[PDB]
Design a protein around this ligand. Structure first.
Ligand SMILES: COc1cc2nc(NCCCN(C)C)nc(NC3CCN(Cc4ccccc4)CC3)c2cc1OC
Ligand SMILES: Nc1ncnc2c1ncn2[C@@H]1O[C@H](CSCC[C@H](N)C(=O)O)[C@@H](O)[C@H]1O
Ligand SMILES: [Zn+2]
Ligand SMILES: [Zn+2]
Ligand SMILES: [Zn+2]
Ligand SMILES: [Zn+2]
Ligand SMILES: [Zn+2]
Length: 251
């Protein structure tokens, strides 16, 4: 029937339609679509000095990533260990390389043709309208960046992605009132998307960015999903059962 032409309202390089042929509930509007994080609650050094397309072994940023994992087409190398994702550091404005060097994928926005859609049982969900090759940057988990003690007083918490730093202090990315398409991605015990911490510029290790990548071929039409984790299923895991229906589910 078609609900909305673009839930992003123009904030994405390509629109993101909403379709509901499951019931009569209208597309959501009780939140605000942002494409970049909203921050509610030293030295900017960490650059490279390349003169190439950052395709060499002398790229500091690439080295800070262990190695530049992006191939000529912005995808991860088969070498990438989707099991335990390495922190990725991309080129910024402190670097000497041009705005279009190999080491720049997440900073170039969304490229996938996505679409919000009503699920028969999970409420709202996200899916691809085109084949997405594995190890492809899909979308970032944008939202309001709140503190540890700020989330401790927010009733709704079904849109909280933690940013755990083993240094006592923890932060979160709240997507309830503000966020992007990622706030609709459902949980799956056998995830096709994997969160990868990424650093661009003006952020310390406490505040990385969450960039989702495809962990295998996500065939056109498939429903996107990532592993919410221990944290979530501990507080919600007792309000409902995991309606994933996957032959290996665990909640
Ligand atoms: C990874 O997905 C979740 C992450 C969460 N992270 C925090 N971080 C803050 C914890 C405490 N401070 C120190 C940060 N709190 C949560 N729930 C909170 C549990 C306590 N409630 C108390 C409360 C409930 C209702 C009304 C008023 C207060 C607020 C939400 C979370 C719930 C999640 O799944 C849902
Ligand atoms: N695999 C899964 N099984 C059961 N519920 C899920 C789920 N993935 C997501 N959800 C549901 O969605 C919330 C996560 S936020 C994702 C948005 C949600 N489906 C919506 O329609 O607003 C949780 O509160 C949970 O009830
Ligand atoms: Zn600067
Ligand atoms: Zn470089
Ligand atoms: Zn660089
Ligand atoms: Zn570069
Ligand atoms: Zn499951």
């Amino acid at each position: 029937r078609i609900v909305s032409r673009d839930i992003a309202r123009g904030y994405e390089r390509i629109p993101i339609p909403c379709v509901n042929a499951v019931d009569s509930e209208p597309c959501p509007s009780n939140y605000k679509y942002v494409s970049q994080n909203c921050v509610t609650s030293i030295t900017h050094l960490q650059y490279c000095v390349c003169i190439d397309d950052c395709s060499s072994s002398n790229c500091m940023c690439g080295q800070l990533s262990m190695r530049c994992w992006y191939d000529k087409d912005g995808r991860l190398l088969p070498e990438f260990n989707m099991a335990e994702p390495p922190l990725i550091f991309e080129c910024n404005h402190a670097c000497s390389c041009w705005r279009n060097c190999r080491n720049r994928v997440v900073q170039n926005g969304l490229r996938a043709r996505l679409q919000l859609y009503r699920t028969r049982d999970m409420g709202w969900g996200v899916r691809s309208l085109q084949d997405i090759p594995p190890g492809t940057f899909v979308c970032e988990y944008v939202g309001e960046l709140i503190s540890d003690s700020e989330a401790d007083v927010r009733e709704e918490d079904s849109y909280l992605f933690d940013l755990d730093n083993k240094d006592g202090e923890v932060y979160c990315i709240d997507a309830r009132f503000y966020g992007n398409v990622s706030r609709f991605i459902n949980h799956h015990c056998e995830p096709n998307l994997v969160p990868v911490r990424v650093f661009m510029a003006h952020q310390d290790l406490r505040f990385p960015r969450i960039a989702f990548f495809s962990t295998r071929l996500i065939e056109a039409g498939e429903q996107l999903g990532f592993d919410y984790g221990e944290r979530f299923w501990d507080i919600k895991g007792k309000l409902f059962s995991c309606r994933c229906g996957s032959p290996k589910c665990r909640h």
